[PDB]
């Protein structure tokens, strides 16, 4: 992202906080409104805002050059901040259901994005498609979180649940819809692109990129140079665990049953040793090359009047 | 009414099918979501959902009250019940409560716990899918979506304000003012319980005049304040649900008025014993409420508030049926 794109995007955030904390309204509840400003300030605008900035970039690469006014690019930035409010609610729910934050802050922050949408977009033709997209993405993300939870019982991973079909569904519902589809579909709607066939062609490619993104992340959790990866300790339905179970003989499966999802550092090393024995690094290398080629082909084939350069830019960001 | 109750209850199974059986790649999680809805949504009194139907029936032109429109009002009532179910799932986890409507709290069910947070957000998100299915073609669609999102935001402000009356699980009695109490009740309870059903009835009746919505709101916030004060009173003075407001350190009307009326010695009993787990501390607080004459104070408030609200309803500007607001008063005051 350019300095100009980043600075213009960041310039919106203080307005969003003022909008949501009723600045100029003279509220009857100033204590809790001031607290909510801190919830937003402490949790929403920090670090990389990749999903929010991707919303702006998607809009800039989908819209007609003539319509790329400072006003329309600022609307794209506001949609980007609504994606970041959703991201912040999800990260808050993560901080809560593993560990100042109150349990209802995740609900509150999620609800706040709809107030921002009403303020800035309610008079535009894209309003209803955009709110329905956020509604649908919220519901599907919750389904993905529940499907992930159905892989654990009484603090132990259920290895019979670790199928590639279930893994692919968790990644799609829990992560890819809100991370990859939502920014691009928002850019399309702000560009007055409503055609279901266009959204569908974008979705096919974005779910493929999202699957590689999570598989790469799962690979690096164990095999990256260090955050220090805890997927094995936490019993996560990781791509590595799924493929290990596909590749295991009965003796190797017994090692997974005994040592996967255990707190002891030695058990994490036993699983890493089994992943090495099973050739998961070589399997990832083959998958990275094969998935790159398939996705590149699908982007070359993209039709329905969609630009290729947006999808190539997304693919190159993930694959480097 | 038997007919109203049965017609309303008949809609629930269709809504569960709409939300779980219309994602064919993930049947395990749709089957689980059906159980989340079946446990948390349809077993209560459904006062708020039924009140949405009654509000609509009293706001709509009699000649437009078709079975089809009454069913739409019922679907909106179930969306209110979905919102409430999400809120109580979350509140029960936050308050670590044992039971709700005489069932174990959802978060206490095997392998839920903090996953109740995801179930809360899921149940709330689900009502917008119901709205899209049945209302997307109607002029009331966007006002209704916006009302649900705004009431969710305001209810969260109420829940967070309630939490600013506690520090590390101990009540902050300096926070227990009638001003803060009134604000908690308005935002945490009255908006979703009283404003939302009536405003939904108004929108389905194509009544969009913000001033009609404002006048309804003034009366409904007054009725909602009495409703919560009565509930607080009965938590301590009701005849056996066994009330635990004292043990929980709740910012109750009884605690607020006790602090107004207390001499320094009585204040110290509140400081020492309010929000403690020991049964004898609850007894000490109840005994202080008796010493301070809170029963007589409630009896006077019940009489005066009834008369003041009846006066305000008589003054409601034409367009709104006084009968609707009197019917709500009669439900709450039982007269
Ligand atoms: C944003 C959220 C989660 C709002 C909760 C709304 C609500 C009605 C809580 C119950 O209040 P309470 O805990 O004072 O009373 P009860 O005794 O009914 O739990
Ligand atoms: Mg990871
Ligand atoms: Mg509670
Ligand atoms: Mg009560
Ligand atoms: Mn509570």
How many helical elements of chain A? 14
Main pleated sheet of chain A: 2 strands, antiparallel
Oligomer category: homodimer
Number of beta-strand segments of chain A: 2
Choose one word for the global shape of chain A. Answer: globular
Largest contact between protein chains? A-B, 47 and 45 residues
- Give helix % range of chain A: over 70%
Tell me about this structure.
In chain A, strands 1-2 form a two-stranded antiparallel sheet. The first copy, chain A, has helices at 3-20, 30-43, 50-62, 70-96, 105-121, 127-149, 164-190, 196-223, 231-234, 239-247, 250-259, 265-277, 280-300, 308-319, and strands spanning 152-153, 156-157. With 320 residues, chain A is mostly helical. Chain A has one domain (1-320). Chain A contains 14 helices and two strands. At the A-B interface, helix 2, helix 4, helix 5, helix 6 and strand 1 of A face helix 2, helix 4, helix 5 and helix 6 of B. The structure holds geranyl diphosphate, magnesium ion (3 copies) and manganese (II) ion. The site of one magnesium ion has 2 residues of chain B, from helix 8.
